Design a protein around this ligand. Structure first.
Ligand SMILES: O=C(CCCC[C@@H]1SC[C@@H]2NC(=O)N[C@@H]21)N[C@H]1CCNC1
Ligand SMILES: O=C(CCCC[C@@H]1SC[C@@H]2NC(=O)N[C@@H]21)N[C@H]1CCNC1
Ligand SMILES: O=C(CCCC[C@@H]1SC[C@@H]2NC(=O)N[C@@H]21)N[C@H]1CCNC1
Ligand SMILES: O=C(CCCC[C@@H]1SC[C@@H]2NC(=O)N[C@@H]21)N[C@H]1CCNC1
Lengths: 117, 118, 118, 120
């Protein structure tokens, strides 16, 4: 289902395991921005979704610090997994940078990523 | 720092531990919405933030399923921690509900929560 | 290049005139939500872009009140026009509802619409 | 209620007239960013709001081009006009900059501005 290796429209790689506890754990590697190699991710998903054809709600976070690079920023992806032959995770995301109070107004980027296996 | 009990403008309770590894673990209790009692949260923060009077970038997720209730939804908060006399976690959030294809355009609420120590 | 009829992925119809002064005027007809028939839109665009190699930044508003229906809400679309063979208006939107204080946390939906000429 | 001079938490000045036609027209001056002096705005508001205590939905745009400067960007504010302790407009906004399609992931800032009629 959710567990596996996903790619988005940028060619970023999202490697995730969906725990029985409703946890998401894995690694993110962004094709773009102030990022190199893998970053830890953690998140949550609805481990008992509706059976009415509705998607499975989920979210995860990456802080853009690893052993190579610190971009003083975090992204959260909020979305739903859509099952089937052509499984999809459809997300919107918020990317917050650590800023001074003067620059807080421009701290947060927003966008949308769709993942496929 | 980040570890401890935070309150937002809705009166919601955010209980978090900030691990040396950059992990956030804890519970969330929403004063509003399709929610009761505490929910598991997990997240990440910049464990080596800039020391320039910049905020500390962080985010976390709550899937709105616990032993009482399932709201078939998930919120992510993305924001920054500011220390000092007036400690704040300033966030914007995305709440996505599980929807049919037809209803996906209205799947996602957006808002902002400001968390304080008192 | 902006002036004319545009269609998004929901099948909504966006009819706009881009004035030489940076104005956007026209009508919006939503294929979804609490809406029927056309609604007035107004907005603004960058009428002096630096390069065709960057999108043309623009935005517009619909208040969801016309002679038929009032959905006590307003959408803003913020995005960029991309010209040429496969012309597109790539947007993110915020749909705010008039809410009681109690419901204000859930006042705003967010999404993304891609407009094409076909 | 909406017609007047407003200021947000950054000290930006929002000057707006709410027309009989549901139109918003006026000027915006940002305290921050790649902006100097006034910019045109246009938008729309709900001219027949609910009578149940609900706020009044509205939205406006500014393209960041005037006679001084061009930041090749536009902001939309989506929000509601309310009462409370005083007259308020609560908004969330999207600020889109001209980018390549490939770099659109970094095109759009998002935030929230609260306006009152108090000079900062
Ligand atoms: O550039 C960064 C860190 C890298 C962010 C990459 C983003 S996450 C959302 C989108 N999807 C994806 O797959 N890649 C992109 N942070 C910057 C922000 C401003 N200063 C640090
Ligand atoms: O209503 C829910 C579940 C509860 C969401 C509470 C939200 S998270 C963002 C904000 N901050 C806070 O402290 N509380 C609120 N899920 C669905 C049901 C229908 N609407 C969303
Ligand atoms: O449902 C409404 C009014 C109609 C909104 C339609 C939205 S605008 C964004 C998206 N793109 C498009 O083409 N159509 C849709 N207002 C309601 C919604 C929740 N309460 C107020
Ligand atoms: O910097 C700019 C143009 C100015 C934007 C000011 C923003 S609108 C939202 C917020 N509220 C307010 O009152 N002021 C700020 N454009 C830049 C963005 C990236 N490159 C062009």
């Amino acid at each position: 289902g959710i567990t596996g290796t996903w790619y988005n429209q940028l060619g970023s790689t999202f490697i995730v395991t969906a725990g029985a506890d409703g946890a998401l754990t894995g690694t993110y590697e962004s094709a773009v921005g102030n990022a190199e190699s893998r970053y830890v991710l953690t998140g949550r998903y609805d481990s008992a979704p509706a059976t009415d054809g509705s998607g499975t709600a989920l979210g995860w976070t990456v802080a853009w610090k690893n052993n190579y690079r610190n971009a003083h920023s975090a992204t959260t992806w909020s979305g739903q997994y859509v099952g089937g032959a052509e499984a999809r995770i459809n997300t919107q995301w918020l990317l917050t940078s650590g800023t001074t109070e003067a620059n807080a107004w421009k701290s947060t980027l927003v966008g949308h990523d769709t993942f496929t296996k």
